[PDB]
């Protein structure tokens, strides 16, 4: 490719990244991000730590 800056679109360079997820088998790994809040004190509450 002889790329030049004065080239119509469709002739200018594009960078490409191809992500390919390939499963297999395991006991655990990456996953979503859990949410949280601001714990309190001196109040019957329903909590998860």
């Amino acid at each position: 490719y002889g790329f030049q800056p004065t080239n119509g679109v469709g002739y200018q360079p594009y960078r490409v990244v191809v992500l390919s997820f390939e499963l297999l088998h395991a006991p655990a790994t990456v996953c979503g991000p859990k949410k949280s809040t601001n714990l309190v004190k001196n109040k019957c509450v329903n909590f998860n730590f």
């Binding site: 004065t6 119509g8 679109v9």
Partner: protein
Amino acid sequence: LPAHLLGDMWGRFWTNLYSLTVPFGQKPNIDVTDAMVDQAWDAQRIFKEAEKFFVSVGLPNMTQGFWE
């Protein structure tokens, strides 16, 4: 017709004979040049109205490298 009275050197176009052959010389042939300088049309309006003519019929826009 004599060859030296036709409007140019070779008689290729007769377009310079219009002032002698005009049918009705008391009617101005329509000329919109004063209405362009009364609305402050720049250099860019003449092509942007031209691009709106072609997109009106179903043809693509200019390529956006066309403008710089």
